[PDB]
Amino acid sequence: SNDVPALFTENFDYQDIRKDFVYGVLTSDLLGKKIHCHVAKENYAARVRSLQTYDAISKDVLSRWVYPFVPDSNLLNQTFSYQRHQIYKEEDVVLARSCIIKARTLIGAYTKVGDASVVANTIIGRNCTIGSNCSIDSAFLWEDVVIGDNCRIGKAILANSVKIGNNCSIEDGAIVAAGVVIGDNTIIEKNKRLTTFESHSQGTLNDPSLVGIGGR
Amino acid sequence: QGEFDIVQVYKKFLQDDPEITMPVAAIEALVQLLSRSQAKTISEFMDILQNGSNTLKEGVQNNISLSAGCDIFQRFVTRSLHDVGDFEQCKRHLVENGKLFIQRARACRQRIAHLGYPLIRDGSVILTHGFSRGVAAVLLAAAKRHVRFKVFVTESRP
C-alpha cells in the first residue's frame, strides 16, 4: 500500500523486505500494522535467484507448468513448436540424420547439430551449432555458440558466443562467459567458473584456456 | 502426309520426354492434330478428334488414364465453344483453350507434391505399392525439404 514508501523513509534501518520489514511489524516495531498471506493452491509462481533455481525453473518451464507462458506460445514472434516428450524446436533448424534428441530438450533456430551427436535435457539458444559424435546432458546453451566435434558436455552453463574445439570435455557445475574459447583436447573440472575479463574468477579467452593458459 | 499417324507424335513425345506420362502425350498430340488442320466446319473438327481419340484409344490397349484423359480433353474444348461471326475463332478457341488444358495438365503432378509432402512427417514410415510418378514427386519433395523417413516398397507382381 501507499503507506509502505513513507513507512520506509521513516524507519530507515529497514533494508530487507523480509528480515527487517516483516520482523518489525510482528515485533510491533512498527505502529501496530497487519500483513497477510495469500497462499496459492494452483497455477505457478517462483523467481530466478540462484543457479540452483535457473536450472530448476527451466525444467519447470519446459514442463508446461506455466502455460500459456511457454515456448509453444511464441510471444515474441519466435517459431517454436511443442513435440512429444517435451522437446522444443524452431523453424529453419537443421538436425542431421543419426543425431538423436532426447526429452526435455529445446532448440533455438538457425542451429546446426552434427552427426551421431546426442543431446538430452538441454536448452539451446538460437544461432548455435554443435559438432559431431558429441554428447550433451542437462546443459544450457545460449546464442551463437559453437561446439567442436566429439565433445562431452554436462550440467554446465555456456554463455553467449562461446567456441569449443574438438576432443574437448567439460563436466558438471562448469560456468563460462562470453567470447571464451577452449582449445582442443581439454577438460574443465567441476564448478570451475571462468570469465573473459580481469576480475575475480580464473577466466581467459584464448585456446587452450585451463592447463594451457592465456592471460593467466 | 498432312497429319501422319498421330500415334507417332504420341510416341515421339514419349521419347522427346520420358518424364511425362501417357495421358499428357495424346493431349499434346491432339492439339497438334487440331493445329495442323483446316476443317471449315465445326462438324469436321469434332469428327476428327473422335476418330483421333479412338485411334489413340484403340492404339494403346485401351489404357484407362489415356482413354480417360482424351475424353476429358474433348468436353473441355466443346464446352464453352461457340461460333460467332467469323470462323477462325473456332479453331482459335479450340487450340488456345486446348493449349491451356495441357498447361494445366502437365503442372498437375507439381500441385500434388506441394499438397502431399506435409503428409510425410519427421521419422514417419511410409508404404507404397509399385511404381507411380505421383508417389515419387511427393516423396522426393519431402526429402528436398529435408525430412527423415523410411519407406517400404511392394514387389508389385506381375
Swiss-Prot record, chain A:
Parts forming coiled coils: none
Superkingdom to which the source organism belongs: Eukaryota
Annotated localization: Cytoplasm, Cytosol
UniProt keyword list: Cytoplasm, Initiation factor, Phosphoprotein, Protein biosynthesis
Keyword Amino-acid biosynthesis included in the entry's annotation: no
GO cellular component terms listed in the entry, alphabetical order: cytosol; eukaryotic translation initiation factor 2B complex
Molecular function GO labels: guanyl-nucleotide exchange factor activity; translation initiation factor activity; translation initiation factor binding
Location (main, coarse): cytoplasm
Keyword match Protein transport: no
A single GO BP: cytoplasmic translational initiation
Quaternary data: Component of the translation initiation factor 2B (eIF2B) complex which is a heterodecamer of two sets of five different subunits: alpha, beta, gamma, delta and epsilon. Subunits alpha, beta and delta comprise a regulatory subcomplex and subunits epsilon and gamma comprise a catalytic subcomplex. Within the complex, the hexameric regulatory complex resides at the center, with the two heterodimeric catalytic subcomplexes bound on opposite sides.
Function: Acts as a component of the translation initiation factor 2B (eIF2B) complex, which catalyzes the exchange of GDP for GTP on the eukaryotic initiation factor 2 (eIF2) complex gamma subunit. Its guanine nucleotide exchange factor activity is repressed when bound to eIF2 complex phosphorylated on the alpha subunit, thereby limiting the amount of methionyl-initiator methionine tRNA available to the ribosome and consequently global translation is repressed.
Family (UniProt): Belongs to the eIF-2B gamma/epsilon subunits family.
Protein's name in the database: Translation initiation factor eIF2B subunit epsilon
Organism: Schizosaccharomyces pombe (strain 972 / ATCC 24843) (Fission yeast)
Taxonomic classification: Eukaryota, Fungi, Dikarya, Ascomycota, Taphrinomycotina
Gene label: tif225
Covered range of the whole protein: 227 to 442 of 678
From Swiss-Prot, chain B:
Name listed for the protein in its UniProt record: Translation initiation factor eIF2B subunit alpha
Complex formation: Component of the translation initiation factor 2B (eIF2B) complex which is a heterodecamer of two sets of five different subunits: alpha, beta, gamma, delta and epsilon. Subunits alpha, beta and delta comprise a regulatory subcomplex and subunits epsilon and gamma comprise a catalytic subcomplex. Within the complex, the hexameric regulatory complex resides at the center, with the two heterodimeric catalytic subcomplexes bound on opposite sides.
Compartmental location: Cytoplasm, Cytosol
Lineage: Eukaryota, Fungi, Dikarya, Ascomycota, Taphrinomycotina
Biological source species: Schizosaccharomyces pombe (strain 972 / ATCC 24843) (Fission yeast)
Family: Belongs to the eIF-2B alpha/beta/delta subunits family.
Effect of residue 44 to K: Increases guanyl-nucleotide exchange factor activity on eIF2
Domain of life (superkingdom): Eukaryota
Annotated function: Acts as a component of the translation initiation factor 2B (eIF2B) complex, which catalyzes the exchange of GDP for GTP on the eukaryotic initiation factor 2 (eIF2) complex gamma subunit. Its guanine nucleotide exchange factor activity is repressed when bound to eIF2 complex phosphorylated on the alpha subunit, thereby limiting the amount of methionyl-initiator methionine tRNA available to the ribosome and consequently global translation is repressed.
